[PDB]
Write a structure and sequence with these properties.
The chain is 0% helix and 44% strand. With 113 residues, it is mainly β. The protein has a single domain (7-102), classed as Immunoglobulins (Immunoglobulin-like, Sandwich). Belongs to the filamin family. This is Filamin-B. It comes from Homo sapiens.
Length: 113
């Protein structure tokens, strides 16, 4: 007996977490998981922008668990400003500042070139 119904909309009900919201690296992908319980309908969206006005590549994917897989690839290191919005309303997990480190490696290896 599965009795489920779409309740009222609410951005507060949206729960966003993950390592991406803790830290990031140039070229890496900020793993972000959004667990919606009673957030009702509405569309999800995120906007990544660095202090130097740098728009990072962001994508949103849906899951059979009713969650969303948000990822961001910082092209340049520096302080980033994550901006999430659910149904046109900011979430309790944004904006969220995150310091991203450079993709500099001490040791070298086989470069595709």
């Amino acid at each position: 007996g599965s009795s489920g119904s779409s309740g009222p909309f609410d951005p507060s009900k949206v729960v966003a977490s993950g390592p991406g919201l803790e830290h990031g690296k140039v070229g890496e992908a900020g793993l972000l998981s959004v667990d919606c319980s009673e957030a009702g309908p509405g569309a999800l969206g995120l906007e990544a922008v660095s202090d130097s006005g740098t728009k990072a590549e962001v994508s949103i994917q849906n899951n059979k668990d009713g969650t969303y897989a948000v990822t961001y690839v910082p092209l340049t290191a520096g302080m980033y400003t994550l901006t999430m919005k659910y149904g046109g309303e900011l979430v309790p997990h944004f904006p969220a500042r995150v310091k991203v480190e450079p993709a500099v490696d001490t040791s070298s290896g086989p470069s595709s070139g």
